Design a protein around this ligand. Structure first.
Ligand SMILES: [Ca+2]
Ligand SMILES: [Zn+2]
Ligand SMILES: [Zn+2]
Lengths: 219, 219
């Protein structure tokens, strides 16, 4: 129904809005299939959403490339930088653990933060995966950079119900490269844009709007 | 006089604009003293600037906190995570190393991304430093988070002339806690907002428009 529409929207390279849940973060993210990302998508995200621009990757891709969770990197590096051990995220409110990963940048980009640079870098990642050029990964990108990556949990929505898993799930259902770029919608009252408020944005912009349970049930 | 003008502005908790040299980044960053940060500050930055919201710390503050360069952490972790080996920052886009450090969220924040959460996270960090409670760092903050920290170079603008050093140097002259929060301004053409547009922006909002080399020369 609504999910199907969302799937069709993704194949056409459009942006969809996704609400997680009232009991979890209670935030709405703008979503786009990374293989169709454009400079215009980013400009719209920094302007109309305002959160962090992140690109979520399916666990299968992360494994083929050896991409780890950021916490695993810090935990290991604490042997030399002790303070990192003190910063461990053992108390995250809305969930057990975060999906944060490393941050990259295309060695070809200048500063890497402009809309053109980020869309370039993101489209390149999605393209290298779709073409199976895994051996060219380390060659095409560097790190750190300005493009933040997220790693979706093994089993997707079965073991974790975050925007990271949900959006990747939708891309899999659409038979696309399981890679998505998401950004949270912030409000003018210093908090996250309300559910009713993001919903309006969706209808007023002809975009499809979904909630966590809808996607999870379809999966 | 132009620099001292920006100084009086920083102490008043105002946002100042800085345009660096054209032979490096050729961009304009929004700048404000982190100890005087507010949700509105973040909101303005994400809407009219759009870049990455970063907090730059004086090298002395970094050493007392144990905060290293993100490149050092990845260089070390590459012993276990091979993917990081092929991403060695040997082709540094600008100077020698990236000023990028770790990302953090104060533990008493919820999602960390909202304007209130990020402003709280930056203000509490300024408070912790000003009160000299360095050993409380891990007690109050967690990593990774939604705010990106930058580590200024030893000797600041004397050894490195990046946005990170110029803005921190200012905080020193202003006799404030040497911690600043910066956001690069993005243009609608997909690139960084040009100097002509930043000047016009500074005028309409009546904000100081300081030059990069002016700050260094005065230092
Ligand atoms: Ca989140
Ligand atoms: Zn989320
Ligand atoms: Zn206090």
């Amino acid at each position: 129904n609504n999910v199907e529409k969302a799937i069709e929207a993704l194949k056409k390279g459009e942006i969809i809005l996704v609400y997680d849940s009232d009991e979890r973060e209670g935030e709405t993210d703008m979503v786009v299939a990374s293989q169709f990302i454009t400079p215009e998508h980013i400009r719209i995200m920094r302007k109309d959403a305002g959160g962090l621009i992140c690109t979520a990757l399916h666990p299968d891709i992360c494994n083929k490339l050896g991409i780890p969770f950021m916490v695993d990197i810090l935990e290991f590096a604490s042997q030399k930088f002790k303070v990192l051990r003190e910063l461990y995220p053992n108390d995250i409110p809305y969930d057990e653990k975060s999906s944060f990963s490393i941050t990259i940048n295309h060695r070809k980009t200048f500063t890497g933060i402009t809309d053109n640079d980020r869309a370039f870098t993101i489209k390149k990642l999605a393209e290298l995966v779709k073409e199976g050029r895994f051996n060219d990964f380390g060659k095409e990108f560097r790190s750190p950079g300005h493009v933040t990556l997220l790693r979706a949990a093994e089993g997707l929505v079965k073991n974790r119900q975050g925007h990271t898993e949900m959006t990747v799930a939708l891309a899999e259902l659409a038979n696309l490269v399981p890679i998505t770029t998401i950004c949270e919608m912030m409000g003018d009252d210093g908090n996250a844009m309300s559910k009713n408020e993001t919903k309006r944005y969706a209808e007023k912009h002809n975009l499809i709007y979904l909630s966590g349970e809808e996607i999870i049930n379809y999966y």
